């Protein structure tokens, strides 16, 4: 409980993270002070009780994996330009 | 696919 504080950068396995809906990018992201987008991995949505697509505004999660990615087409599910680098993060519920 | 067309791991 004392170690339950939300990480804000350099996300590591085991970090507590605040996962928030980002309407502009049509996806859940991690709250961060990084300039880089950290998207929630699509495989993590069911176990966080989240849905694809009135979506729940936030959940608290625990980081399981991080993956560095780059958009290869101008039209993509993350609504970022061609060449944008971003992360995908797998997370499970903090509870 | 469409997904791996859109983005990749780097």
Domain coordinates of chain A in residue numbers?
16-93
Three-state DSSP class for A59?
strand
Question: B7-9 and A16-22 as β-strands: parallel, antiparallel, unpaired?
Answer: unpaired
B1 touches chain A (CB under 8 A): no
Query: What are the structure tokens assigned to A77, written together?
Result: 């599910």
Query: What is the Cα–Cα distance from B10 to A86, expressed in whole angstroms?
Result: 10
For residue A16, CA distances in Å to A23, A30, A47, A63 come to 22, 10, 16, 7
DSSP state of A6: B
* Residue with the two structure tokens 């809906």: A21
Method used to solve the structure: X-ray
Nearest Cβ partner for B9 among A67, A73, A78: A67
Report chain A residues whose CB lies below 8 A from the CB of B3. Answer: 77
A31 touches chain B (CB under 8 A): no
Beta partners for residue A87, in sequence order: A38, A68
Q: What is the total residue count of chain B?
A: 10
Residue A10 region by backbone torsions, left for phi larger than 0, else alpha for psi between -120 and 50, else beta: left
For residues A29-57, b (16+ Cβ closer than 10 Å) or e, as one string? bbebeeeebbbbbeebbeebebeeeeeee
A36 touches chain B (CB under 8 A): no
Query: What is the Cα–Cα distance from A70 to A59, expressed in whole angstroms?
Result: 26
């Amino acid at each position: 409980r004392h170690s339950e504080k939300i990480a804000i950068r350099d996300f590591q396995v085991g970090d507590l993270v605040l996962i928030i809906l980002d309407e502009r990018h049509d996806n859940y992201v991690l709250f961060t002070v990084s300039p880089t987008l950290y998207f929630l991995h699509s495989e993590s949505l069911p176990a966080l009780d989240l849905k694809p697509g009135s979506r729940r505004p936030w959940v608290l999660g625990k980081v399981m994996e991080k993956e560095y990615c780059q958009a290869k087409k101008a039209q993509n599910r993350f609504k970022v330009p061609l060449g944008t680098k971003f992360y995908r993060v797998k997370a499970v519920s903090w509870n | 696919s469409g997904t791996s067309s859109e983005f990749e791991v780097v």
